[PDB]
């Protein structure tokens, strides 16, 4: 049973899963849109949006707490600069997931996840 258990293990050990989520968060912050499997993107949406909410308080404390998740200097700089400037005044829902198709090698369901403020044609 898994009644009211609310995160995906993603077929990995806990340390591997946390490392992969941190890497995906850094990749999404650096390149504003990335392509990945649907399940991984849905886990990343849970993981990464509380991290973007921490940039609404530009302090040393919030920078350090964000760095505890990220451990990436360039990602931290971009996130507390341009990403924060763009996602100010948006009350959550910073990301969007759109499905695209299937892979040749394993028929994995594919999608891309992006930040809604860096897509112009989607208003």
């Amino acid at each position: 049973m898994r009644h009211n258990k609310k995160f995906n293990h993603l077929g990995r050990k806990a340390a591997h899963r946390k490392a992969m989520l941190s890497n995906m968060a850094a990749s999404l912050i650096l390149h504003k849109r990335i392509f990945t499997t649907v399940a991984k993107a849905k886990a990343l949406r849970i993981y990464v949006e509380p991290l973007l909410t921490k940039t609404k308080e530009d302090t040393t404390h919030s920078r350090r707490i964000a760095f505890s998740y990220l451990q990436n200097k360039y990602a931290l700089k971009e996130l507390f600069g341009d990403v924060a400037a763009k996602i100010a005044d948006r009350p959550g829902g910073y990301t969007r997931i759109l499905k695209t198709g299937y892979r040749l090698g394993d028929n994995a369901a594919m999608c891309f996840i992006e930040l809604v403020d860096y897509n112009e044609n989607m208003l």
Binding site: L98, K99, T100, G101, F112, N119, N121, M122, L123
Partner: protein, 56 residues
Amino acid sequence: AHPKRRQSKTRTAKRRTHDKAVMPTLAKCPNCGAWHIYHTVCGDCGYYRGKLAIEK
């Protein structure tokens, strides 16, 4: 552990009754005019729900 008898052609086909290939869920593009998977970005034009999503 071991089949006592070999199966007849009829028995084999009766089991294989329920083997089938799933039909994809295809929607028509009202503007573009082609097939794409429902709830999925139309890869020919890159549009999704009337808005451009993937810029060629």
